[PDB]
């Protein structure tokens, strides 16, 4: 599923991401835009053999199990395929765990390079909400 900008914003707010750990809704919408272009089915292979999954490109080395990343961990205790559903519930719960681990949203490289410090409130402009 390719979400619309305001559609994803309302979904993220309903699942409790608005201001979670002090990060406003626009930050999460911006991060999703540059990580996956709002496509829930996005997948990307890393050089170390791990894979990134879903709307927020969560990594298999630490957070989920895909059965093909030898030596990995599974801190969200969930199959990586569950992060590709049209329903973003699993991705949001895991992202809540990730952002609390110590380095905040710097866990997402695209957020650090393209969203951090910018006028992120623009990403929720025009949405009823
Ligand atoms: C969205 C996503 O999956 N991003 C991936 C990053 O999570 C990952 O970076 C590494 O993440 C781990 C787990 O959060 C970091 O470990 C933590 O380190 C801090 C101190 O910096 C400490 O508070 C924690 O104890 C420790 N957690 C543990 C041990 O469970 C680690 O610092 C990150 N490594 C880096 C930044 O080099 C990167 C790299 O694998 O991939 C992203 O896709
Ligand atoms: Cl980047
Ligand atoms: Na794993």
From Swiss-Prot:
Subcellular locations according to the entry: Secreted
Keyword Disulfide bond assigned: yes
Enzyme class label: hydrolase
Disulfide bond annotation, renumbered to this chain: 6-127, 30-115, 64-80, 76-94
Matching PROSITE patterns: GLYCOSYL_HYDROL_F22_1, GLYCOSYL_HYDROL_F22_2
One annotated Gene Ontology cellular component of this protein: extracellular space
CDD domains assigned: LYZ_C (cd16897)
E.C. designation(s): 3.2.1.17
Alphabetical list of SUPFAM superfamilies matching this protein: Lysozyme-like
Catalysed conversion reaction: Hydrolysis of (1->4)-beta-linkages between N-acetylmuramic acid and N-acetyl-D-glucosamine residues in a peptidoglycan and between N-acetyl-D-glucosamine residues in chitodextrins
Active site: 35, 52
SMART domains, sorted: LYZ1
Keywords tagged on the record: Allergen, Antimicrobial, Bacteriolytic enzyme, Disulfide bond, Glycosidase, Hydrolase, Secreted, Signal
Keyword Hydrolase: yes
A Gene Ontology biological process term: defense response to Gram-positive bacterium
One MF annotation (Gene Ontology) recorded for this entry: identical protein binding
Residues passing through the membrane, by range: none
Superkingdom, natural source: Eukaryota
Cited InterPro entries: Glyco_hydro_22, Glyco_hydro_22_CS, Glyco_hydro_22_lys, Lysozyme-like_dom_sf
Family stated for the protein in its record: Belongs to the glycosyl hydrolase 22 family.
PANTHER family for the chain: LYSOZYME C
Summary of the function given for this chain in its UniProt record: Lysozymes have primarily a bacteriolytic function; those in tissues and body fluids are associated with the monocyte-macrophage system and enhance the activity of immunoagents. Has bacteriolytic activity against M.luteus.
Quaternary data: Monomer.
UniProt name for this protein: Lysozyme C
